[PDB]
Amino acid sequence: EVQLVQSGAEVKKPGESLKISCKGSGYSFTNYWISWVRQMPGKGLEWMGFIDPSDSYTNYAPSFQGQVTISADKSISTAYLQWSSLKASDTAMYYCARQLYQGYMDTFDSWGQGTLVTVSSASTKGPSVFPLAPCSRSTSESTAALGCLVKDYFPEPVTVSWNSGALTSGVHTFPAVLQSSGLYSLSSVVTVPSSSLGTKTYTCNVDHKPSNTKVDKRVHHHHHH
């Protein structure tokens, strides 16, 4: 089967160079043009440009001309996208796609799995984890919400579990937000029986691979401050 496999996610600082790659297989690499497409976080698809691997002819969208370089190594059926100097604004998912001319137009019939590129002046940092618990006398209803606030980490992602994975029902772990500090923050919450609040313990388990850290936090509200 036709297959494009892209290189792994990259976390970079502004000013650094970066070359990412796209390896084709299951077809004659040299016979099909390859396009690169950008997708910024939460946004749509943007065509960047293409290369004809056979003669190395390239073409770029106006906004990308001079900004990036597309190349190919037919020897190894590989296409490349590269920047001399990254900016935070280059943060996005990047796809390579095979072009198949059908119905008298170029179509992108096969896509790589995407390469996430994060560009930030931030440095790797593990999260702080704080409990989310209701004020002592505010739980009126039969069900209550508890949670953990996972703050000030970089880069994404963290993974959050509850009670070592024993608790999965009613858990919502929210998308991270990027703070003005350049660090991420997210919350994970769970709804539980109001009656269990005095009986059962609830602990969030937060793993952050990039910093090699793991933080457990028992959720409660103290009776003095």
């Binding site: 119905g103 008298y104 704080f130 069900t143 998308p175 919350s187």
Partner: protein, 214 residues
């Protein structure tokens, strides 16, 4: 270059529905329009090319029509695997351009949010910052208004929020909003409140606490 405009930007539909999404080009592109499907975290998939030609392996419930500047993608008898974002793409001339996407979401009945407020932890306060969190749990539709009030004054510019994707079991959303203050500012005020407006609520719901009585 040629601008592609899709409508609507999002829509909610039920399994079995006939769904129609439109694409408008800023100038004629003849028949040279393709449609793509994309799910979160995943690569796009080609569905239709040359306006109405079905890509090999794509289910025939997908069909495309149109010519010139106005095109439509139709999904007959929408299936559970079809909730996703759809993009048009013109291939008339370079530079190739895509529409901004249409997200097809799951229709269900109105559900009011359950609202919770959480005061900052003592551990956080020790380090100089106070995060106050408001949770809106399991609501539908997605549109919701959260307003923070501190000593009964509306807050602006000091909160961030985010929203889950639709729940796999009940198709609802949840939302978390965080109000961030310095410890010094937190300690000077008394009343912390989040006020929620949503179609499922007859009037706004407010959850609050008093610092020092919490």
């Amino acid at each position: 270059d040629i601008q592609m405009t899709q409508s609507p930007s999002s829509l909610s539909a039920s399994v079995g529905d006939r769904v129609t999404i439109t694409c408008r080009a800023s100038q004629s592109i003849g028949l040279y329009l393709a449609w793509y499907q994309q799910k979160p975290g995943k690569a796009p998939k080609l569905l239709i090319y040359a306006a109405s030609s079905l890509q090999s392996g794509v289910p025939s419930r997908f069909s495309g029509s149109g010519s010139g500047t106005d095109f439509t993608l139709t999904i007959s008898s929408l299936q559970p695997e079809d909730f996703a974002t759809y993009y048009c793409q013109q291939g008339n001339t370079l530079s190739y351009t895509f529409g901004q996407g249409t997200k097809v979401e799951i229709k269900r009945t109105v559900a009011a949010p359950s609202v919770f407020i959480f005061p900052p932890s003592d551990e956080q306060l020790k380090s100089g910052t106070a995060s106050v969190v408001c949770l809106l749990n399991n609501f539908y539709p997605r549109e919701a208004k959260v307003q923070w009030k501190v000593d009964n004054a509306l807050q602006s510019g000091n909160s961030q929020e985010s929203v889950t994707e639709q729940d796999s079991k009940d198709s609802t959303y949840s939302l978390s909003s965080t109000l961030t203050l310095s410890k010094a500012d937190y300690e000077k005020h008394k009343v912390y409140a989040c006020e929620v407006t949503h179609q499922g609520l007859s009037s706004p719901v407010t959850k609050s606490f008093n610092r020092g009585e919490c």
